[PDB]
């Protein structure tokens, strides 16, 4: 029974591990969204630079 | 013939004495058997619990 409780503990650790990795995965996806915005901002700034009348 | 009746009763008492000592000897044998069987039962209990554990696992 004690080993089973440890086996249940192993199952909970796997679940704990799974939830922790899922949290990190969604956090990484959120950071990608922030990066895409900033990379778009770079492209928007380039378009502004191409406009002599505002870039000067 | 009273002395013969008395000796025959002595023989009967001797047999009674033997029969009880023998019963005590069996008691001892039965107790050892009980311990041996107990261990056999423990090994089978462990087997059952082990099978259940693996199924659950």
Automatic annotation (TrEMBL), chain B:
User: Where does this protein reside within or beyond the cell?
Assistant: Endomembrane system
Q: Where is the composition biased (Basic and acidic residues)?
A: 33-53
What family is reported? Belongs to the V-ATPase G subunit family.
Assembly and interaction partners: V-ATPase is a heteromultimeric enzyme made up of two complexes: the ATP-hydrolytic V1 complex and the proton translocation V0 complex. The V1 complex consists of three catalytic AB heterodimers that form a heterohexamer, three peripheral stalks each consisting of EG heterodimers, one central rotor including subunits D and F, and the regulatory subunits C and H. The proton translocation complex V0 consists of the proton transport subunit a, a ring of proteolipid subunits c9c'', rotary subunit d, subunits e and f, and the accessory subunits ATP6AP1/Ac45 and ATP6AP2/PRR.
Q: What role does this protein play?
A: Subunit of the V1 complex of vacuolar(H+)-ATPase (V-ATPase), a multisubunit enzyme composed of a peripheral complex (V1) that hydrolyzes ATP and a membrane integral complex (V0) that translocates protons. V-ATPase is responsible for acidifying and maintaining the pH of intracellular compartments and in some cell types, is targeted to the plasma membrane, where it is responsible for acidifying the extracellular environment.
Q: What is this protein called?
A: V-type proton ATPase subunit G
Name its species: Rattus norvegicus
Q: Which residues of the full protein are shown?
A: 3 to 59 of 118
